[PDB]
């Protein structure tokens, strides 16, 4: 009976990345792959082993991306895409950052956006003194139906009230403005 001894396979294999700001190095050189996993059990072994986002020094990031997509604008699956951005104030590092980030991780590995989960590339949390950010990256900023559906589902899974609006920005606009709001 496989149920008693097999790990539970995820729909995708995922890679977690870490960024630490070091002014001696280029941005790309500061980005490092931490490890990959493709089962529920290996996801939790990795999550339980690493620091909470709220405990990282300012200027660090985590990124979780599908295996084979690097967490940068230049990747073939990100260059035409964008991100749903959650901006946190300084008080929300205490209240919401870690629970929003873990909910974001679970939206990814559990493929929570129905048919549009294939548009998801990954997610990024930026820990910064000025205010942290969490974002889900999708692969095509022109797919209105995929993008808007991901944003609506994500907003409800974060539990954000209708008093809050979140915006979607294309990486091309960042690399050089919300395309969509929910």
mmCIF file of C-alpha atoms in Angstrom:
data_model
loop_
_atom_site.group_PDB
_atom_site.id
_atom_site.type_symbol
_atom_site.label_atom_id
_atom_site.label_comp_id
_atom_site.label_asym_id
_atom_site.label_seq_id
_atom_site.Cartn_x
_atom_site.Cartn_y
_atom_site.Cartn_z
ATOM 1 C CA UNK A 1 0.000 0.000 0.000
ATOM 2 C CA UNK A 2 1.796 3.116 -1.245
ATOM 3 C CA UNK A 3 -0.197 5.407 1.049
ATOM 4 C CA UNK A 4 1.735 4.192 4.098
ATOM 5 C CA UNK A 5 5.304 4.878 2.899
ATOM 6 C CA UNK A 6 5.515 7.076 -0.217
ATOM 7 C CA UNK A 7 6.195 10.786 0.003
ATOM 8 C CA UNK A 8 3.513 12.943 -1.536
ATOM 9 C CA UNK A 9 4.611 14.263 -4.931
ATOM 10 C CA UNK A 10 4.015 17.882 -5.753
ATOM 11 C CA UNK A 11 2.712 18.914 -9.144
ATOM 12 C CA UNK A 12 5.989 20.792 -9.719
ATOM 13 C CA UNK A 13 9.592 20.608 -8.559
ATOM 14 C CA UNK A 14 10.489 23.880 -6.866
ATOM 15 C CA UNK A 15 13.775 25.687 -6.133
ATOM 16 C CA UNK A 16 14.271 28.030 -3.168
ATOM 17 C CA UNK A 17 16.776 30.858 -3.670
ATOM 18 C CA UNK A 18 18.409 33.274 -1.236
ATOM 19 C CA UNK A 19 19.681 36.800 -1.884
ATOM 20 C CA UNK A 20 21.915 38.723 0.478
ATOM 21 C CA UNK A 21 22.852 42.292 -0.319
ATOM 22 C CA UNK A 22 26.605 42.628 -0.687
ATOM 23 C CA UNK A 23 27.751 45.859 -2.284
ATOM 24 C CA UNK A 24 31.017 44.180 -3.415
ATOM 25 C CA UNK A 25 29.078 41.985 -5.863
ATOM 26 C CA UNK A 26 26.644 42.380 -8.712
ATOM 27 C CA UNK A 27 22.979 41.687 -8.087
ATOM 28 C CA UNK A 28 23.105 38.402 -9.994
ATOM 29 C CA UNK A 29 26.187 37.304 -8.056
ATOM 30 C CA UNK A 30 24.309 37.846 -4.767
ATOM 31 C CA UNK A 31 21.580 35.378 -5.771
ATOM 32 C CA UNK A 32 22.149 31.702 -4.828
ATOM 33 C CA UNK A 33 20.129 28.530 -5.172
ATOM 34 C CA UNK A 34 19.516 26.978 -1.714
ATOM 35 C CA UNK A 35 17.888 23.703 -2.671
ATOM 36 C CA UNK A 36 15.173 21.984 -4.618
ATOM 37 C CA UNK A 37 12.292 19.797 -3.555
ATOM 38 C CA UNK A 38 9.327 18.050 -5.192
ATOM 39 C CA UNK A 39 7.294 16.467 -2.360
ATOM 40 C CA UNK A 40 5.212 17.848 0.508
ATOM 41 C CA UNK A 41 7.554 16.156 3.004
ATOM 42 C CA UNK A 42 10.685 17.670 1.460
ATOM 43 C CA UNK A 43 9.013 21.112 1.358
ATOM 44 C CA UNK A 44 8.331 21.050 5.095
ATOM 45 C CA UNK A 45 11.807 19.676 5.901
ATOM 46 C CA UNK A 46 13.263 22.681 4.100
ATOM 47 C CA UNK A 47 10.815 25.247 5.547
ATOM 48 C CA UNK A 48 11.367 23.985 9.132
ATOM 49 C CA UNK A 49 15.166 24.264 8.651
ATOM 50 C CA UNK A 50 15.442 27.891 7.471
ATOM 51 C CA UNK A 51 14.990 31.255 9.085
ATOM 52 C CA UNK A 52 11.620 32.978 9.088
ATOM 53 C CA UNK A 53 11.546 35.953 6.740
ATOM 54 C CA UNK A 54 10.983 38.298 9.668
ATOM 55 C CA UNK A 55 14.372 37.182 11.106
ATOM 56 C CA UNK A 56 16.465 37.854 7.993
ATOM 57 C CA UNK A 57 18.794 40.827 7.978
ATOM 58 C CA UNK A 58 17.505 43.789 5.917
ATOM 59 C CA UNK A 59 18.369 43.507 2.252
ATOM 60 C CA UNK A 60 17.812 39.756 1.962
ATOM 61 C CA UNK A 61 15.279 37.904 -0.204
ATOM 62 C CA UNK A 62 13.853 34.445 -0.475
ATOM 63 C CA UNK A 63 12.480 33.329 -3.840
ATOM 64 C CA UNK A 64 10.602 30.102 -4.639
ATOM 65 C CA UNK A 65 10.465 29.384 -8.380
ATOM 66 C CA UNK A 66 9.503 26.425 -10.510
ATOM 67 C CA UNK A 67 12.559 24.330 -11.318
ATOM 68 C CA UNK A 68 14.275 25.779 -14.393
ATOM 69 C CA UNK A 69 13.050 29.383 -13.930
ATOM 70 C CA UNK A 70 15.597 31.684 -12.355
ATOM 71 C CA UNK A 71 14.078 34.427 -10.083
ATOM 72 C CA UNK A 72 15.093 37.286 -12.319
ATOM 73 C CA UNK A 73 13.512 39.437 -15.008
ATOM 74 C CA UNK A 74 15.883 38.094 -17.655
ATOM 75 C CA UNK A 75 14.650 34.480 -17.518
ATOM 76 C CA UNK A 76 12.782 33.509 -20.671
ATOM 77 C CA UNK A 77 9.644 32.784 -18.587
ATOM 78 C CA UNK A 78 9.744 36.125 -16.723
ATOM 79 C CA UNK A 79 10.813 38.688 -19.364
ATOM 80 C CA UNK A 80 7.241 39.108 -20.691
ATOM 81 C CA UNK A 81 5.650 38.682 -17.253
ATOM 82 C CA UNK A 82 4.995 40.681 -14.123
ATOM 83 C CA UNK A 83 4.078 40.367 -10.469
ATOM 84 C CA UNK A 84 1.229 40.802 -8.010
ATOM 85 C CA UNK A 85 2.790 42.973 -5.319
ATOM 86 C CA UNK A 86 1.916 43.014 -1.574
ATOM 87 C CA UNK A 87 3.588 45.969 0.173
ATOM 88 C CA UNK A 88 3.973 45.750 3.955
ATOM 89 C CA UNK A 89 4.634 48.634 6.306
ATOM 90 C CA UNK A 90 7.162 48.364 9.108
ATOM 91 C CA UNK A 91 4.565 47.154 11.611
ATOM 92 C CA UNK A 92 3.472 44.344 9.282
ATOM 93 C CA UNK A 93 6.865 42.654 9.468
ATOM 94 C CA UNK A 94 5.731 41.588 12.954
ATOM 95 C CA UNK A 95 2.067 40.957 12.160
ATOM 96 C CA UNK A 96 1.809 39.615 8.627
ATOM 97 C CA UNK A 97 5.093 38.975 6.847
ATOM 98 C CA UNK A 98 5.700 35.358 7.917
ATOM 99 C CA UNK A 99 2.064 34.250 7.644
ATOM 100 C CA UNK A 100 1.631 35.956 4.232
ATOM 101 C CA UNK A 101 4.863 34.395 2.959
ATOM 102 C CA UNK A 102 3.928 30.898 4.092
ATOM 103 C CA UNK A 103 0.479 31.302 2.562
ATOM 104 C CA UNK A 104 2.222 32.412 -0.652
ATOM 105 C CA UNK A 105 4.454 29.301 -0.588
ATOM 106 C CA UNK A 106 1.386 27.095 -0.198
ATOM 107 C CA UNK A 107 -0.491 28.860 -3.020
ATOM 108 C CA UNK A 108 2.454 27.930 -5.266
ATOM 109 C CA UNK A 109 3.187 24.311 -4.293
ATOM 110 C CA UNK A 110 -0.482 23.447 -3.928
ATOM 111 C CA UNK A 111 -1.294 24.949 -7.369
ATOM 112 C CA UNK A 112 -4.125 27.044 -5.980
ATOM 113 C CA UNK A 113 -4.968 29.096 -9.079
ATOM 114 C CA UNK A 114 -6.934 26.323 -10.854
ATOM 115 C CA UNK A 115 -6.125 26.308 -14.600
ATOM 116 C CA UNK A 116 -3.976 29.431 -14.327
ATOM 117 C CA UNK A 117 -1.366 27.922 -12.004
ATOM 118 C CA UNK A 118 0.676 27.154 -15.151
ATOM 119 C CA UNK A 119 1.099 30.946 -15.502
ATOM 120 C CA UNK A 120 2.778 31.140 -12.091
ATOM 121 C CA UNK A 121 6.560 31.362 -12.198
ATOM 122 C CA UNK A 122 7.236 31.770 -8.487
ATOM 123 C CA UNK A 123 7.232 34.200 -5.588
ATOM 124 C CA UNK A 124 9.650 36.597 -3.911
ATOM 125 C CA UNK A 125 9.789 38.161 -0.439
ATOM 126 C CA UNK A 126 12.044 41.219 0.003
ATOM 127 C CA UNK A 127 13.029 42.008 3.590
ATOM 128 C CA UNK A 128 13.878 45.736 3.734
ATOM 129 C CA UNK A 129 14.170 48.418 6.368
ATOM 130 C CA UNK A 130 11.852 50.727 4.415
ATOM 131 C CA UNK A 131 9.064 48.117 4.257
ATOM 132 C CA UNK A 132 8.969 44.469 3.082
ATOM 133 C CA UNK A 133 7.402 43.143 -0.109
ATOM 134 C CA UNK A 134 5.937 39.807 -1.226
ATOM 135 C CA UNK A 135 5.086 39.152 -4.839
ATOM 136 C CA UNK A 136 3.832 36.345 -7.087
ATOM 137 C CA UNK A 137 5.463 36.395 -10.513
ATOM 138 C CA UNK A 138 3.506 35.207 -13.564
ATOM 139 C CA UNK A 139 4.850 34.615 -17.009
ATOM 140 C CA UNK A 140 2.814 36.923 -19.290
ATOM 141 C CA UNK A 141 1.620 40.376 -18.233
ATOM 142 C CA UNK A 142 -0.744 40.492 -21.250
ATOM 143 C CA UNK A 143 -2.868 37.471 -20.201
ATOM 144 C CA UNK A 144 -5.594 39.476 -18.504
ATOM 145 C CA UNK A 145 -7.738 36.477 -17.562
ATOM 146 C CA UNK A 146 -4.876 34.508 -15.990
ATOM 147 C CA UNK A 147 -3.386 37.511 -14.236
ATOM 148 C CA UNK A 148 -6.660 38.820 -12.819
ATOM 149 C CA UNK A 149 -7.772 35.374 -11.644
ATOM 150 C CA UNK A 150 -4.440 34.837 -9.874
ATOM 151 C CA UNK A 151 -4.708 38.244 -8.204
ATOM 152 C CA UNK A 152 -8.290 37.693 -7.017
ATOM 153 C CA UNK A 153 -7.559 34.246 -5.565
ATOM 154 C CA UNK A 154 -4.312 35.438 -3.974
ATOM 155 C CA UNK A 155 -6.013 38.406 -2.336
ATOM 156 C CA UNK A 156 -8.640 36.185 -0.703
ATOM 157 C CA UNK A 157 -6.104 33.567 0.409
ATOM 158 C CA UNK A 158 -4.123 36.350 2.116
ATOM 159 C CA UNK A 159 -7.382 37.446 3.712
ATOM 160 C CA UNK A 160 -7.061 41.043 2.570
ATOM 161 C CA UNK A 161 -10.246 43.103 2.984
ATOM 162 C CA UNK A 162 -11.968 44.977 0.142
ATOM 163 C CA UNK A 163 -10.572 48.173 1.698
ATOM 164 C CA UNK A 164 -7.168 47.072 0.336
ATOM 165 C CA UNK A 165 -6.307 47.114 -3.344
ATOM 166 C CA UNK A 166 -3.274 45.329 -4.775
ATOM 167 C CA UNK A 167 -1.580 46.041 -8.094
ATOM 168 C CA UNK A 168 0.096 43.989 -10.836
ATOM 169 C CA UNK A 169 3.229 45.408 -12.494
ATOM 170 C CA UNK A 170 5.073 44.157 -15.538
ATOM 171 C CA UNK A 171 8.768 43.431 -15.099
ATOM 172 C CA UNK A 172 9.487 45.529 -18.204
ATOM 173 C CA UNK A 173 8.117 48.570 -16.366
ATOM 174 C CA UNK A 174 10.170 47.661 -13.291
ATOM 175 C CA UNK A 175 13.392 46.984 -15.221
ATOM 176 C CA UNK A 176 13.412 50.392 -16.877
ATOM 177 C CA UNK A 177 2.567 51.576 -13.030
ATOM 178 C CA UNK A 178 -0.122 48.963 -12.359
ATOM 179 C CA UNK A 179 -1.506 47.073 -15.350
ATOM 180 C CA UNK A 180 -4.221 45.478 -13.188
ATOM 181 C CA UNK A 181 -5.709 46.029 -9.725
ATOM 182 C CA UNK A 182 -7.855 43.725 -7.585
#
